[PDB]
Amino acid sequence: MNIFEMLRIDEGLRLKIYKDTEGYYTIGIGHLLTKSPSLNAAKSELDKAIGRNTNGVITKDEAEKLFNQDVDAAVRGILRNAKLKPVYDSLDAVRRAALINMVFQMGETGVAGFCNSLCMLQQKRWDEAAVNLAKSRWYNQTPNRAKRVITTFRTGTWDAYKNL
Numbered sequence: 001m002n003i004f005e006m007l008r009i010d011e012g013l014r015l016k017i018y019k020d021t022e023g024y025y026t027i028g029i030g031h032l033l034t035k036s037p038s039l040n041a042a043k044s045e046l047d048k049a050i051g052r053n054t055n056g057v058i059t060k061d062e063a064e065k066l067f068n069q070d071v072d073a074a075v076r077g078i079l080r081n082a083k084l085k086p087v088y089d090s091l092d093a094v095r096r097a098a099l100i101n102m103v104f105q106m107g108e109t110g111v112a113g114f115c116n117s118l119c120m121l122q123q124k125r126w127d128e129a130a131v132n133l134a135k136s137r138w139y140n141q142t143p144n145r146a147k148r149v150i151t152t153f154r155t156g157t158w159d160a161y162k163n164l
């Protein structure tokens with residue numbers, strides 16, 4: 001297991017434009033295209049992202065390319081965020097992946113809003129952090145995924161992704 005395989009499990013793979021859990025146009029492996037309600041707007045974002053006229057469909061190679069860029073960007077973003085970097089730096093590699101997973105899903109600003117939980121993680125109070133992480137819109141709206149990510153923070157193991 002690693003961050004790519006983890007997010008591949010959590011995000012799935014679809015080669016046509018689809019709506020994510022929040023209703024937003026997305027493609028590939030959880031590549032958000034736009035929050036616009038316009039499918040044409042989403043198609044324009046897609047073409048811009050891929051570099052050709054796609055008409056809403058991409059290949060697996062193209063999906064994986066956007067995914068690599070998205071993971072890279074998530075990580076590099078954490079390292080540039082003054083609130084996130086110290087927490088990330090304090091973690092082991094497995095828990096680092098859990099934090100990247102959250103950023104991938106909700107963005108740096110979203111994750112910065114978990115300051116109560118982030119402080120507990122930095123302190124290595126794993127059970128307490130796990131309890132606090134579940135007190136969130138995130139957990140309520142995507143409970144199965146949140147549970148997997150929280151288990152990863154709690155245990156520092158890949159147990160929640162083993163049979164998946």
Ligand SMILES: *SCC1=C(CS*)C(C)(C)N(O)C1(C)C
Nearest residue numbers: 082083086087115118119122
């Ligand atoms: S998110 C609140 C913050 C934390 C966690 S206790 C820390 C990384 C220490 N930090 O610099 C703050 C004040 C942004």
Ligand SMILES: [Cl-]
Nearest residue numbers: 048049066069
């Ligand atoms: Cl992009």
Ligand SMILES: [Cl-]
Nearest residue numbers: 142143144145
């Ligand atoms: Cl879920």
